[PDB]
Amino acid sequence: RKIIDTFAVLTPSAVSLDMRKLALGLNDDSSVGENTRLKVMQNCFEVSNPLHQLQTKLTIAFPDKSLLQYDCGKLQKLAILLQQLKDNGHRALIFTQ
Amino acid sequence: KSLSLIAAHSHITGLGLDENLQPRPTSEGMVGQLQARRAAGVILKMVQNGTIAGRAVLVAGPPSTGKTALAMGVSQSLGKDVPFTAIAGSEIFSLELSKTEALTQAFRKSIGIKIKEETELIEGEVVEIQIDRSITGGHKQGKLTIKTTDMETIYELGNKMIDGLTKEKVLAGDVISIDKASGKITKLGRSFARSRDYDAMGADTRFVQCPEGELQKRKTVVHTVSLHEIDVINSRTQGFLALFTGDTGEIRSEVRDQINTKVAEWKEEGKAEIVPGVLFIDEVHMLDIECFSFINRALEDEFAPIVMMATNRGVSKTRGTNYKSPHGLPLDLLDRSIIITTKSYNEQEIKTILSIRAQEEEVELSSDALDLLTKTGVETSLRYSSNLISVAQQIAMKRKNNTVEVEDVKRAYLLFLDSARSVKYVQENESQYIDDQGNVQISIAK
Amino acid sequence: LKSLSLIAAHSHITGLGLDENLQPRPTSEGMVGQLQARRAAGVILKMVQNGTIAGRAVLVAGPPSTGKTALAMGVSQSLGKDVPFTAIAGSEIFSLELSKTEALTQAFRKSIGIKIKEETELIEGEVVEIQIDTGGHKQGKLTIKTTDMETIYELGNKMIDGLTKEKVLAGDVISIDKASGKITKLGRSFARSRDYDAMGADTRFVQCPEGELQKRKTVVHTVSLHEIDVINSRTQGFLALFTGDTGEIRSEVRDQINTKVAEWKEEGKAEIVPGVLFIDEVHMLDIECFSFINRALEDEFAPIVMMATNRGVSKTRGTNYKSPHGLPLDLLDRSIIITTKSYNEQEIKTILSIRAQEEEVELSSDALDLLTKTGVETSLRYSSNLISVAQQIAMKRKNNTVEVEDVKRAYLLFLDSARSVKYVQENESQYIDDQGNVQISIA
Amino acid sequence: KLFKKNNQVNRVDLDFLNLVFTLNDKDLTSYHAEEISKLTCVKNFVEEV
Amino acid sequence: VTRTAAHTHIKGLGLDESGVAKRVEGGFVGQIEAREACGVIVDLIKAKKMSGRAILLAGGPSTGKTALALAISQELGPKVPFCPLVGSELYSVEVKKTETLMENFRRAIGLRIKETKEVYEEVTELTPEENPLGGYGKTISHVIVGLKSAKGTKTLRLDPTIYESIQREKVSIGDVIYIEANTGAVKRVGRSDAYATEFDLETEEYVPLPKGEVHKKKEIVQDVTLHDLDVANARPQGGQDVISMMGQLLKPKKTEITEKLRQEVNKVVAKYIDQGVAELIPGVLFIDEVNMLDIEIFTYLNKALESNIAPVVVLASNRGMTTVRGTEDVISPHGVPPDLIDRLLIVRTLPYDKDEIRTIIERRATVERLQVESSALDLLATMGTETSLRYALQLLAPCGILAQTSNRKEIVVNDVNEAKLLFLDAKRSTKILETSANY
Amino acid sequence: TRTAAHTHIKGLGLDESGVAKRVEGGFVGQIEAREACGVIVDLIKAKKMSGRAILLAGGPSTGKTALALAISQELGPKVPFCPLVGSELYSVEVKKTETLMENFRRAIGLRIKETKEVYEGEVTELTPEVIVGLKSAKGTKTLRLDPTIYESIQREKVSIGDVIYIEANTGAVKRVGRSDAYATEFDLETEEYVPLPKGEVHKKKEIVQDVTLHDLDVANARPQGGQDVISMMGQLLKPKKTEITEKLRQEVNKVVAKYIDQGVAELIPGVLFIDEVNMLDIEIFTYLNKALESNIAPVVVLASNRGMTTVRGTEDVISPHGVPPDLIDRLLIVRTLPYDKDEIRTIIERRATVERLQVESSALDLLATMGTETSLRYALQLLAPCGILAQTSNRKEIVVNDVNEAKLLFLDAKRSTKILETSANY
Amino acid sequence: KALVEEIDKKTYNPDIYFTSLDPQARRYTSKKINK
């Protein structure tokens, strides 16, 4: 789990809806039976999936959280100074325009 | 339409001819090749007749003498609504399908059928939908109101189509088309009614619409489908997906026989028409003896389209065998076909072609520049000049002048080499390139 | 006529024509001549019927159309049913899904079968009229009736839990085992035929079974080793016994099956019947195939291998050198060769008469003599087909018997190989040459 | 819709006449089938006939 | 408005009752001996006795072998199967060539079967259903359904299972259905046409009422091939679970059908034949350019021909003394190994003559609906005799196009000359190919 | 930093007039080739032509691959650039022509603009139909959702009090995590906590994401759906790639043409580079000949170092650079010249200064003489062992002793062949 | 239907769908509409 969380990043560049459902023939209009399509979808929903987390990680990716501190030159020095100041029991007023 | 950048045959627009099948000296893109042009026109008329099947014509000649150009011309002059499948000989060898199956699919793709049906249609502006719940007296009490340009009328829904209009969020005040038998609802956008009510929607609705006529009429729907599409459709549960994924996988012969019988029954039942298009094969010498043997029999079938072939070589060794044959084709296949030959090109014809290419690539040429390009084309080749003319445009723009002069052409000639010059340079310094046996000298000294 | 054969190429042959002392009679059971080969084949048949010898290579060699395939067909017919006889050709070995060795191993495994017995007990005749009324569906009793027995059985919680699923209408003949298994639906009594007017897709009317309720039976199944391997290979491998996509069964399954068969034979539940693997046109086969056979012949689970070939000193496929019979000397060493000789005029005449008798064709004496003469000058199969062609000729002429005129018309209507070769040689220009040079134009 | 118009007019159900027997291995036993075949052959409808 | 392709001007062998071939009948001219031999062969095929006979036609290109085989197929009739193939068609990619050869071998013989069925067809009313008195939580004893039809109505009683099948179909009360009591399956034909205009719109097609008696007794006769049964058993279509339908979703690729399945199919077919229910009919397998076959398929043909239910195979070849493909030092006639040509019979086809070529050109012109002159026809015949028979037949159509362009209905000498100058043949192309620098 | 035989070349080093300076952009010499490459670069930037085909021919160690890389780097990251070798076209599951066409489609690009609608925040209620009562830090709104997105929600084991993040365009669902409000429920609770998102629950954004034609061709050729189990099993059903029918390509072309006509997207043709074209066979050459005369083909550049050799796949067809004459006829040839002593010395100096190494003048002259005597690549590669040998002696500057010891330790091709010929045991 | 749709939790009758050009914006049965 830890490895698959850390090293799964890439997502498809382009996706086309109404094609995943059409691949299996399970849609509103298809040559398969109207009720035969219901049995298989019910069975599939009852079927569990052990690869779900990989599916979530390979569809939408979030741009981390720490990089906000990393991506600004002033923020790193501000964090260092604030940590040093708090460890010594001080309080600060910040000013900006 | 069909957004494209440029093609080597972009200027060609449907051959060039008269009402008497006579070729003009210069018309619709191509020049010269009068006899070949008239032969292509005769073949085109034969194709348009549609009463003759399985004819093989082989266009042969030296390279760069209007062969693919002639094929593009006949394809364009044939127009749409008639299939034209152009394939290369090197794309039949596949790891998924046997060459026979690929050739059969190519043959079937080139013949189409038009299926005509008659359907009643209901069109007009809808102004209000009313929907009720489930009641003992009636399962669903729903009504629809339709406004045409001249009529307003009330329809009553019969417990199913309400699911049709609730499957997708539709709303009143727009023109829609609904089929009595099919039951499909097609929302064409938004009605006209009052301009202001739909003038602030942020474009959309496909430039709105206005009701035209009455409520219901009777129209004819024609569907054009290739035969190969029919075999793919009937082969599997969902073959229309295979029409894009390309995993048909050697459809069985029983399906093809059933398709043939049913299509014939339709044809003498008056329910469908047949359009026998054209199949064109470039670089036919790249095929195999097995493919030629299969073509020998596939040509004689009733549903055999007109086949055109393009080859360059003369008296070469056919692939899959060990003997030399003319055109790279076996004797029997040559006997089964009709040969159209092409000649070389005159200096005047080369100049006219270069001028056509110039006006096609929005490049202005001075008279002396065109003369120099024509001289180079006569000396070396047509395609070299047809490339130099485009490459000199950037050099011209580098001098901040749009017109192309002699200096630009000279610079392009001295910058980009040619086959003869490259061969001479290679033979002069063969010790630097990699030899046939793989011996190379890299050190400058000694 | 149990098989669907109309008329085979050699269907007149039913076993080898030999007697108790193994001496082959001059003509019996559809075989004529070839006394030495028939005697050798009878010895081979005795060896395979004995079942105490494993992995023997016998090779039948002779010029074409001398009875090698006929001899093997006679051996197979004389061996009788219940004994496997896997007949294949060389060209079938090369496959696009399995390697050559895998296909050879599958053929070897198919060649030998096993008889496995199974003892079971059943209860049949469940014309019940159940009696179930405490709480939770109490009163677990039901009756059982048949022709000679009738008794009431009490029920347990698990028994009624099984009964409620697959409901029994209390008037349908049902079966159940005492092996703590599943109660099996069998059918409905004839008394409930008139009740409805359109029966379902799973309802049948079986008569009331007779005898005793608790029956015990032994059933013997004849299964090849290859079938066992295929069944145990996958989750549902039995379907691959029809589709054929087994896919190179691994060695672990094979050795496990070998141990299982050894245990079954030791316990007396099964017995092995060896068979015969016959290979037509063994001359065309890769050096890899012969290399594999050289070692596969030495296994304990090895059948008797018969091979047929008609080549002289020819090149073996996959190599550059020439060997006798198109086989390496290493394989030829571990085999015994039965050689078939050419045919005599009288034997040819007798074979022609037998074949004509098989097709209900009445030949005149002179017609038969001319046919024998043609079959002596040309090959025998040419005349063998000419008899049927001439029978059709005569039938078109409204005459039952075939005469010399019909035979001569058939001879001049269909061409022998030698005449066709001569005509091709005399007209080389019209036919396509080896270099693809032809002269279509007549002038 | 056009092709599925003359289906039942010339179609014979292969499963009905025991021609697709390949699936009968799934839920049929040998001895039960033998007992059915024993208690199969007519001899009852003819009486009422 | 009828299409033609190198044929359709032949419609038989042109033989009288006695088997004598008329000179010009059925679209054929000449080739008396070959036509007589092919008529004898088709008579033997109609005899329905033999199994595995093999005929091979020999002759130069454009001599009538394919025409002879198509004439045999036309003479046989639509009922008897006729499977045509090219030699190169056997080299499949999905499965080994031997399997494809066996499949096409079995596709040639056919089987005509018959089956008698009862059926019931406007639904009037239906009532479902007694006391449990046992382990039945919910009991539906029987269902009463009434049908209207056209030639009188009738009601009946039917099992709960067919009622659940109806509920699966989910039919209404004013509908027309199709219930087959053989399999106990109900098919909803649709609504009733006379029940129209209940609502202003309705998607479902209303469909008229069934004609005749509701309780229909009928019999059906179908022609299939043993390959159809083999395919049906190898890849069954039944199944409701996920696995079966998802297997149906994958592309159907050919496999190696086992011998045991074929043996069981043969046993079942024989059992049905013995009852008189069905009868078998052998067909014909036709192969073009057998020289395209390699040594492996040629060897396997020996084993296949000597089988028990092999059909009649007709082979075509135009080569002379050539090396059999697949081996490098085996010179054989027609590119067929000596054993195979020892196993079959040979029919020779002779080259045509000037008058025969002229008559063929005239027949093709008549069947193409074209007008020609006697002088023009003579020039065309001389041209064909100078280059090839096929050249004139191919060149006929552009001559017609050129004639139509100048508003003239008859082919004339100048049109033929113009077509000659416009379109070349193999000989002139060969003569002008080597006399040039660039190929 | 990391260097690998390159990254000292930063462009063609041309001026506005197009005249190549003698030394500029990590380049020395090769003036004519650089000018021709700049002309080709301008032609590509014009975005008018289609299917133009040039190849640059010369001996080994002359800068052909360097020229192609410089062209790619000068074009810019905006323009797609597909590099390839001749041996990649021989795939296993698809034919060679299909792979070549796949690369052709991959070569050109399309820049499009799209609007994405997003919902996020804490979940208040979840009632089956699904109705979701989303609540942000300022707004609250209830939404109706499809069964598929409901199944994705269920597979995410979401519950009341979980800040989530739904995307409307694709249906992607991601549970951000437990809301910070319930931060006191278990002293060792494993679940992480996140503050409520800021702003209204519904937001819209405009993005300019780029794509390639092959990307949106394979998009509907085979899917990569996502979190739905049905889509997962559908994409698992077929694991192998397949040849794409021309009908799909035509439909893709029509859709892209409609998009660009609507003023929503623009088309940027790219370059396809093929190094060592001599590995191609006759069939691929013929198919490329056919495919060059198309209306969407990009600019293809080819590299080869061959004399008059036999085309692979043929027996006796000899041609220059191992390219069939018919394909040569529609080609533009760019010559490449060998180097001189001073050029070799300058290149060695540049490669030394990019690798942060100090080489004295005498050592540099010895290296230049060695490069002239043996090869340029050998002299370039012998720099690092010399640096390590200098470092081991606790020094920084390369000395004549260092290059002599490097010569002793490592051998070039000539001496290796000499010791190979004059030996008994192979 | 298009996935993800906004509702305001008021009314929201899945079996009642009323749409018009809003000239009166009144149901035909709002309060037994009659007299």
Ligand SMILES: Nc1ncnc2c1ncn2[C@@H]1O[C@H](COP(=O)(O)OP(=O)(O)O)[C@@H](O)[C@H]1O
């Ligand atoms: N008659 C013509 N009119 C206009 N362009 C021509 C003509 N003949 C040849 N060309 C030019 O030649 C090129 C095509 O050469 P082509 O004849 O296809 O070579 P090949 O015969 O080797 O395939 C095209 O770019 C086209 O512009």
Ligand SMILES: Nc1ncnc2c1ncn2[C@@H]1O[C@H](COP(=O)(O)OP(=O)(O)O)[C@@H](O)[C@H]1O
């Ligand atoms: N002793 C025999 N008895 C009956 N028929 C025979 C005998 N010998 C040969 N034949 C006939 O010869 C044919 C078998 O030829 P065979 O020698 O098997 O050819 P090949 O050697 O090519 O396998 C059969 O059709 C059979 O009728």
Ligand SMILES: Nc1ncnc2c1ncn2[C@@H]1O[C@H](COP(=O)(O)OP(=O)(O)O)[C@@H](O)[C@H]1O
């Ligand atoms: N005796 C004949 N009568 C009429 N047409 C013939 C005759 N012989 C040949 N033909 C015609 O010649 C054409 C080509 O002959 P074909 O049978 O294809 O030669 P091949 O035997 O080499 O295949 C056919 O379309 C056929 O109609």
Ligand SMILES: Nc1ncnc2c1ncn2[C@@H]1O[C@H](COP(=O)(O)OP(=O)(O)O)[C@@H](O)[C@H]1O
């Ligand atoms: N003008 C140049 N300036 C600097 N280095 C060059 C120059 N030309 C070639 N090189 C170097 O020569 C080496 C060989 O170049 P490359 O094009 O990759 O192979 P080849 O020249 O053999 O085709 C490259 O590592 C490159 O750094």
Ligand SMILES: [Mg+2]
């Ligand atoms: Mg071309």
Ligand SMILES: [Mg+2]
């Ligand atoms: Mg034999």
Ligand SMILES: [Mg+2]
């Ligand atoms: Mg033929």
Ligand SMILES: [Mg+2]
């Ligand atoms: Mg390089």
